[PDB]
């Protein structure tokens, strides 16, 4: 789990996906997967190519590997995420290790559009992710 949660109209986020997530992904009718995690952050971590193999059998038609680290997220990353969603079949599921990076890529864009920072944080929290430790960076994107 119950960690695949809605962050926006066409966007779910999640912690690291596993083969076992195929059923729920199919049930939600996910059409596009965005992975925001570099491969090989942890030994147990499935590589994106293998997630793609498992989930192509789950009705997902678009796959994008957009690796970032929370620390290194820049403007180029934020607008690349925005564009991938804009051109995607819906709904989109984005994941990283925890969903933090997905939520930040989303949230930096909302800040630019004028969403108040507290609202960004409240919305991400409603998708299971606490962005309180990024409050200052979020503010600076507005």
Q: Given the rule CB under 5 A, which of 18-26, 61-69, 74-82, 108-116 is the region that contacts Cl ion?
A: 61-69
Q: Smallest gap, in angstroms, from Cβ of residue 97 to Cl ion?
A: 13
Question: 41 or 119, CB closer to Cl ion?
Answer: 41
Q: Given the rule CB under 5 A, which of 66-74, 83-91, 101-109, 124-132 is the region that contacts Cl ion?
A: 66-74
Please count the other Cβ atoms lying within 10 Å of the Cβ belonging to residue 98.
Answer: 18
Q: Smallest gap, in angstroms, from Cβ of residue 142 to Cl ion?
A: 30
Q: Smallest gap, in angstroms, from Cβ of residue 47 to Cl ion?
A: 8
Q: Does 67 bind Cl ion (CB under 5 A)?
A: yes
Q: Smallest gap, in angstroms, from Cβ of residue 26 to Cl ion?
A: 26
Distances (CA, A) of 87 to 80, 94, 108, 128, 135: 11, 14, 19, 25, 29
Instruction: Identify whether the C-beta of residue 34 lies closer than 8 Å to the C-beta of residue 17.
Output: no
Closest to 42 in 3D by CA, of 4, 96, 2, 1: 96
Q: Does 38 bind Cl ion (CB under 5 A)?
A: yes
d(CA 86, CA 41): 28
Please give the residue ranges that form the binding site for Cl ion (CB under 5 A).
38-39, 67
């Amino acid at each position: 789990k119950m960690a695949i949660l809605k962050l926006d109209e066409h966007l779910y986020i999640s912690p690291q996906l596993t083969k076992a997530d195929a059923e729920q992904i199919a049930q939600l009718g996910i059409k596009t997967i965005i992975c925001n995690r570099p491969d090989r952050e942890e030994e147990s971590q499935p590589d994106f190519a293998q997630i793609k193999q498992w989930l192509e059998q789950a009705g997902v038609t678009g796959f994008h590997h957009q690796p970032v680290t929370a620390r290194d997220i820049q403007k180029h990353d934020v607008e690349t995420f925005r564009q991938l969603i804009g051109q995607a079949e819906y709904p989109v599921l984005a994941y990283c290790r925890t969903g933090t990076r997905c939520s930040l890529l989303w949230g930096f864009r909302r800040a630019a559009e004028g969403m108040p920072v507290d609202e960004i944080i409240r919305r991400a929290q409603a998708a299971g992710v606490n962005l309180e430790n990024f409050r200052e960076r979020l503010d600076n994107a507005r």
